[PDB]
């Protein structure tokens, strides 16, 4: 009965900091959540943890010679509300396989059983640029189920969604991971809810919901906390929570259909 | 049971009626084998001609291939240099691999290392690896250079071999002026003989390109060879004499001859040999540079006639008579010195033996494999022999390599039953044999099996292997042999035509059946 | 003595750098039986130090060289690259009766034979026609396996996927194998993966199902790959004992054999480096009891027997009887002609995870003293078992290296050194007897009374052959 | 006189929009420039070909067999101006391995003779997230000398530029490749400018430029058109320019070295 989600986008649109906030919002109405971390710079999981530097399982798994000779206990990490933290881990940018790194924290995770009889949800919070397999990792099977993209009303968040769905659906095909909707960011651009519902109407998906660009959230990050352990009283904390109440009351699980360059020029040219 | 007096080995001590009947006990009781029957009907459908067309449709399916990867011919290329250390940036599987592979076959020593990358140097990258590596690469086995190759493994995550060799030369770990030549060795891209051609074209990147303003082409009157993914000594022998009996001076880059042929005097040499540093450093003064094996050095014919301005001749593989003719005289022509009457005496022995044994040569029929350059250099040689090659088959061929054999095959009126099939492993030659019968085959060990399978069918079947190529596993000492110039036509006549002779033999050997025709005097 | 082994390891580490030096003085240790721990003396199953020419292999070779590959009815894929698949063909005498091409596979190599673009775009579509083509073109195969290299596991390839719909669409059993080389640090994670693959796709088939027929007398040979035939060897003495073998683990085996195993009484494991996993879990899972054996030599023969028939009823404990006694005056005769010219030469061994400690009972049945062992990936439980069976102030080394090795065969000087291919002609070379022990140098079988006979012969030819009286010439 | 640049960052900052109108602009004051993009998503020329792809290095080399029986003509188009344009592309997200191809397609342009035509800049678009070393082939030796990283007032973007910075020290050390700049795309945040020069002085870099954010460049790329072919009187269109001529001008090669986050804390209390 333990739910899995992952998160996708395209880079910088804001996958890491709503994951984070959402699964504190989650953890304020009390379910336990984990969060698994598959971007080789670790921020995954820095507002939870309030801190910069943590134990990755490959730093660990380097100093224990090798990934069989690894403990759980060393690497798993509690946080606030019980939420459980784990960093996949990975090289500096510029050397190296961070897809191999994935493949092997996520093969670690499942062989020493990390999710417990316990776990409400877990969530894999995945690289923007996914571009091998091991970036894959967390949506095969016996892995997560559902699938949340994370966009914007720009040219950028809806293509790189667009190709997001293309690359799911031949894992939909060949498994049972479905997409669940999708999460727009706002960058306060013009007309940004009617063209997310469009693009979402065009896959045959829904719109999750909307978060608007609020300068609250940064300043939160200045001091490694959510907007949630910030003053609860803020409008984005409710905004959170909504979020947290809409992705616990989710549905809808469809099969992405991907449209051709054409369907995003007819939509451009819509506004 | 065993009788100290006779011992027997597996065979034949499992064809005892004991162990007959134990091995027959747990075939009815255990494997549910499949019926007899099924199995003899399944190997006839097997050697009919629907097969092969289902077998030659083939698409992501490769049974018993023939060839190998990158590194391999990477290493072949490092042992032939003084003091010279195979190093290989990757899995340590691969170097166990070959080394086993060397040893197989030369039986001989076969030095290389790794820097042994793990799961934790695949996700970081291997720069500590080959610092360490280095470091103790030099400290114990004490070489002179150390030439790095790397694994598909290395390859696929983009490790940066000159950055990580600059640093681990800045940080201290090897001295500056350490010697430390790389090449990028994928082994998803071409086969051993690209590795080979990439090896040698990185170790004279690293010896002359910096150093090319004060060379002056046909300064040390000398020509270059390179001979390229050799096995077999007798090959590095019969140039080397030859080019001496002529007088010819010569620099042979990459002469793995005394590391492979290390005699057997109390004392293990891991270093023997070798074309030394002052010769690669020497090479763009010579003047010209003479590959054996045109088909696979692309890359350093590229090299050296982009950066050495050497006017590499358009010569094939010094093989059979015809194209040893024309590598004499164009080494005459570079050097200006004329041909000897010791090598026109040779020639005139070589043409004495094949005017003796045109008679038992002439009509056979011949599916052969292996290399391009030495593959090509078969079929011209069979072509002057009268034979008829009508399988002929190159793994790692291309295009260009096919329409050049298919322009020698139309030369020859010998050539009018000759099919050239690149891209295609053993198995594909297994249908080939079955469906059009040639006389023998020629090939490395790996053909044995073929002519088992055709034993299988009949006696009247059977296409013998002839062992020519690499490797050769199940004979002992045949690396020895010479395949260029006019003592290696010799050779492979020699072969040739005591094979036809003996298979006649075998087929006669019948008293009152086929003993009419075994003849004293053949 | 034991200070003159000491010294003499100083000594050869002394050439290393700090960092390998410090890691290599933990793989070098002097015997001592009355220690039960040998974590104490010995540390094993480490990544071997970079650039230091180990002979260690990957856990591919551990796989499918070692565990899946002498499955006959089988047909095993090696995915990936060209290389692996080729240096592997045919170099392990894993031997076996059947029509190879048709029904048998084991020395034919098949591969997916990756190009560039099979690592950029992937391989899972190639991966789905090569199965379709090896299911048209050998139809009475029994099953694929399809075993992992580098490239696989780095680009992240679903090869679970591609199995599991591929045998859902054919009703085929397809095992997917992640051996890819940079896993682990030597062939001992290829044994444990490919026994977890076993265990997971192949053993609990037949687990509603009772049409076999069970006697209580049936048992399984695990860990033996029939090199040179030395399954045969030990299966003819299992059945005169009166057992009722049903699988042999893996060496001539059929997949049928493997799906059998869970039905017998008890388990006999030779090769408990490799097998140990399998054997704990079908003990979990079904109960079967496990037991180790060793039948190298007379001695380790008779004693192994006498074990195995003390866990049946009397009639098996008087056939095993009668077994060593029609046996006995073959070994005796063998002794007698071979002891005497080989008593008191003495023998090195480096061999992989079992051979290094099964084979010495052999060498002691032969008036040989073994001066030195050592292994390339056994685990500390190995060494715990071998302490006891080595003499008082003995050689023990761990993933040793070309340099060490060399200078210990140097300072020690024995006799004879049983070890691979990749240092017979070396020690061919200075002068003394070399006996491949991976590979029986293309004889065999060695495994029971019919093997020992050709051990000793093999031995004594090698060792007094007159070549090692001509190395040095007479003017030199 | 052949200078080779490469621009890094964070993903979604604007490195392809800012390198395609760089291009542009450089292209209006008469330098023949080739850019090479080495992003699987194959968009680092939509704006100057004014079209989504034409024919990848990686798609041809798969549909002819091999790279090697590839020409040089059938991979590279040119574009307005007469820039001249070249895409490693690679495959759809999850499969495969984009890097190795990167690291075939940059081997094919120099083993074909690409930087031999007279060029004056050659412009690496890479994207933000350098997972291998395949990304990190711009940067090896003999190819691109300067490195600009852009990143504007963000938490994770000043972090990404320090991660970037820490992969560059290797190659650094190493070879002749130096970061040449720091260009600063904008959020409309408080006081962004002051800040980013802090962290251009307090790196040991200049700061190049900084580009406002103008809904034209979103209004230009619906019609796949460069912002200085859709309007070049508008007071974008000319910020461009002047981020050319500094490009052009830029001396100040030095080594990145980076700096600490508790440090780079007190800048927020400054802004
Ligand atoms: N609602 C918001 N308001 C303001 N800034 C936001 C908001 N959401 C995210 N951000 C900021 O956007 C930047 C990128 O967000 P985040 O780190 O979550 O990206 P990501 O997509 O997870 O990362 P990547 O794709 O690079 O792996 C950060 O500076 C973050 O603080
Ligand atoms: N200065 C600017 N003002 C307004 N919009 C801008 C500006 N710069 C870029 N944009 C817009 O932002 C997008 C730029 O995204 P772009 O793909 O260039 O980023 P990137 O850094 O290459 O991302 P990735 O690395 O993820 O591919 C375009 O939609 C463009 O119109
Ligand atoms: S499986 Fe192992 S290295 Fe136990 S990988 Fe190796 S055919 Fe050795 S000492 Mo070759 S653990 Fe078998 C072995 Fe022993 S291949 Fe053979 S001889 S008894
Ligand atoms: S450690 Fe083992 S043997 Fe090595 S690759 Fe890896 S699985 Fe295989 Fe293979 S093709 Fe050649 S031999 Fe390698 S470089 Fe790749
Ligand atoms: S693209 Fe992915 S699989 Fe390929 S090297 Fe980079 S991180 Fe590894
Ligand atoms: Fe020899
Ligand atoms: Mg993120
Ligand atoms: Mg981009």
């Known amino acids: 009965a333990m739910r899995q989600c992952a998160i996708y986008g395209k880079g910088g649109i804001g996958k890491s900091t709503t994951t984070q906030n959402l699964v504190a919002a989650l953890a304020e109405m009390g379910k336990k959540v984990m969060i698994v971390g598959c971007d080789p710079k670790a921020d995954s999981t820095r507002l939870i943890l309030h801190s910069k530097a943590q134990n990755t399982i490959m730093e660990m798994a380097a100093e224990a010679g090798t990934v069989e000779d690894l403990e759980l206990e060393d690497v798993l990490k509690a946080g606030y509300g019980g939420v459980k933290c784990v960093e996949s881990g990975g090289p500096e940018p510029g050397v190296g396989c961070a897809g191999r790194g994935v493949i092997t924290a996520i093969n670690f995770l499942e062989e020493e059983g990390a999710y417990e009889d316990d776990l409400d949800f877990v969530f894999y919070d995945v690289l923007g640029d996914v571009v091998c397999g091991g970036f894959a990792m967390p949506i095969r099977e016996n892995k997560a189920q559902e699938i949340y993209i994370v966009c914007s009303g720009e040219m950028m968040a809806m293509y790189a969604a667009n190709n997001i769905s293309k690359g799911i659906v031949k894992y939909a095909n060949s498994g049972s991971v479905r997409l669940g909707g999708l999460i727009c960011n706002s960058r306060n651009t013009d007309r940004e809810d009617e063209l997310i519902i469009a693009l979402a109407n065009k896959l045959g998906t829904q719109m999750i919901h909307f978060v608007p660009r609020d300068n609250v959230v940064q300043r939160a990050e200045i001091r490694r906390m959510t907007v949630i352990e910030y003053d609860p009283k803020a409008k984005q904390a409710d905004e959170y929570r909504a979020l947290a109440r809409k992705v616990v009351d989710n549905k809808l699980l469809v099969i992405p259909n991907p449209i051709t360059m054409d369907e995003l020029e007819e939509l451009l040219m819509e506004f | 049971s065993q009788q100290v007096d006779k011992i027997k080995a597996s065979y034949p001590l499992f064809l005892d009626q004991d162990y007959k009947d134990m091995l027959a006990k747990k075939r009815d009781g255990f494997e549910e084998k499949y019926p007899q029957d099924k199995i003899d009907e399944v190997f006839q459908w097997t050697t009919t001609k629907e097969y092969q067309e289902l077998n030659f449709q083939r698409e992501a399916l490769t049974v018993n291939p023939a060839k190998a990867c990158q590194p391999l011919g990477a290493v072949l290329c490092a042992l032939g240099f003084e003091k010279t250390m195979p190093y290989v940036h990757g899995s340590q599987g691969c170097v166990a691999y070959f080394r086993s592979y060397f040893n197989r076959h030369f039986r001989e020593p076969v030095s290389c290392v790794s820097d042994s990358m793990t799961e934790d140097a695949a996700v970081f990258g291997g720069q500590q690896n080959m610092k360490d590596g280095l470091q103790n690469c030099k400290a114990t086995y004490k070489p002179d250079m150390i030439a790095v190759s790397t694994t598909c493994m290395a390859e696929v995550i983009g490790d940066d071999l000159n950055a990580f060799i600059n640093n681990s030369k800045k940080e201290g770990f090897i001295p500056d002026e350490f010697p430390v030549p790389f090449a990028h060795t994928p082994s998803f891209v071409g086969s051993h003989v690209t590795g080979w051609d990439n090896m040698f074209e990185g170790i004279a990147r690293y010896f002359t390109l910096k150093s090319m303003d004060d060379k002056v082409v046909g300064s040390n009157k000398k020509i270059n060879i390179v001979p390229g993914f050799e096995t077999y000594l007798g090959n590095f022998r019969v140039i080397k004499r030859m080019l001496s009996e002529m007088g010819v001076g010569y620099s042979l880059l990459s002469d793995p001859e005394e590391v492979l042929d290390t005699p057997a005097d109390g004392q293990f040499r891991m270093y023997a040999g070798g074309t030394t540093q002052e010769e690669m450093k020497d090479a763009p003064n010579a003047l010209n540079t003479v590959l054996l094996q045109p088909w696979h050095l692309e890359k350093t014919k590229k090299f050296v006639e982009g950066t050495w301005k050497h006017e590499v001749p358009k010569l094939n593989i010094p093989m059979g008579l015809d194209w040893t003719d024309e590598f004499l005289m164009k080494v005459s022509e570079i050097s200006g010195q004329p041909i000897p009457a010791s090598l026109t005496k040779e020639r005139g022995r070589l043409v004495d033996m094949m005017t003796d044994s045109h008679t038992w040569l002439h009509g056979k029929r011949f599916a052969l494999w292996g290399d391009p350059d030495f593959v090509m250099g078969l079929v011209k040689f069979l072509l002057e022999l009268g034979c008829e090659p009508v399988h002929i088959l190159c793994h790692n061929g291309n295009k260009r390599w096919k329409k050049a054999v298919d322009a020698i095959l139309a030369a020859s009126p010998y050539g009018k039953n000759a099919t050239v099939y690149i891209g295609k492993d053993l198995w594909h030659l297994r249908s080939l044999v079955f469906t059009d019968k040639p006389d023998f085959m020629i090939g490395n060990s790996y053909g044995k099996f073929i002519q088992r399978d055709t034993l299988h069918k009949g006696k009247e079947f059977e296409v013998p292997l002839i062992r020519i190529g690499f490797p050769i596993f199940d004979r002992h000492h045949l690396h020895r042999s010479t395949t260029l110039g006019y003592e290696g036509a010799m050779q492979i006549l020699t072969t040739l035509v005591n094979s036809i002779l003996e298979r006649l033999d075998e087929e006669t050997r019948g008293m009152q059946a086929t003993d009419y025709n075994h003849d004293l005097v053949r | ?476």
Chains 1, 4 share one sequence.
Request: with cysteine.
């Open chain 3, 1 to 476: 003595s034991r200070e003159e082994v000491e010294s003499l390891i100083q000594e050869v580490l002394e050439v290393y750098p700090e960092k390998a030096r410090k890691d290599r003085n933990k793989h070098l240790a002097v015997n001592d039986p009355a220690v039960t721990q040998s974590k104490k003396c010995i540390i094993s199953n480490k990544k071997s130090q970079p650039g230091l020419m180990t002979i260690r292999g990957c856990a591919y070779a551990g796989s499918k060289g070692v565990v899946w590959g002498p499955i006959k009815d089988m047909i095993h894929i090696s995915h990936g690259p060209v290389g692996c698949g080729q240096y592997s063909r045919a170099g392990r005498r894993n031997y076996y009766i059947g029509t190879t091409g048709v029904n048998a596979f084991v020395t034919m190599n098949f591969t997916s034979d990756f190009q560039e673009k099979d690592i950029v775009f992937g391989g899972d579509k190639k991966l789905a026609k090569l199965i379709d083509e090896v299911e048209t073109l050998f139809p009475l195969n029994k099953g694929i396996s399809v075993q992992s290299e580098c490239p696989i596991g780095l680009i992240g390839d679903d090869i679970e996927s591609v199995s599991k719909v591929k045998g859902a669409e054919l009703s085929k059993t397809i095992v997917p194998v992640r051996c890819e080389g940079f896993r682990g640090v030597s062939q001992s994670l290829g044994h444990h993966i490919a026994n977890d693959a076993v265990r997971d796709w192949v053993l609990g088939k037949r687990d509603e199902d009772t049409t076999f027929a069970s006697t209580p007398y049936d048992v399984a040979i695990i860990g033996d790959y029939n090199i040179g035939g030395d399954a045969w060897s030990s299966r003819i003495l299992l059945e005169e004992m009166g057992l009722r073998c049903v699988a042999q683990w893996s060496g001539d085996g059929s997949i049928s054999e493997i799906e059998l195993t869970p039905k017998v009484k008890l388990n006999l494991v030779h090769c408990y480096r490799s097998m140990n996993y399998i054997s704990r879990h079908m003990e979990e899972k079904y109960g079967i009891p496990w037991m180790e054996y060793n039948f190298f030599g007379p001695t380790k023969t008779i004693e192994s027997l006498r074990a195995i028939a003390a866990k049946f009823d009397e009639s098996i404990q008087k056939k095993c009887e009668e077994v060593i006694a029609k046996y006995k005056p073959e070994w005796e005769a063998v002794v007698a002609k071979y002891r005497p010219r080989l008593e008191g030469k003495r023998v090195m061994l480096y061999i992989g995870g079992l051979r290094p400690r099964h084979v010495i009972g052999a060498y002691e049945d032969l008036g040989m003293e073994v001066v030195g062992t050592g292994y390339e990936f056994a685990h500390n439980d190995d060494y715990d078992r071998t302490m006891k069976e080595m003499g008082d102030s003995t050689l023990l080394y761990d993933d040793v290296t070309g340099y060490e090795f060399e200078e210990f065969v140097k300072r020690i000087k024995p006799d004879l050194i049983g070890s691979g291919i990749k240092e017979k002609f070396i020690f061919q070379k200075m002068g003394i007897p070399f006996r491949e022990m991976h590979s029986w140098d293309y004889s065999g079988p060695y495994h029971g009374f019919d093997g020992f006979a050709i051990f000793a012969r093999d031995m004594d030819m090698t060792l007094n052959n007159p070549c090692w009286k001509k190395l040095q010439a007479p003017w030199e």
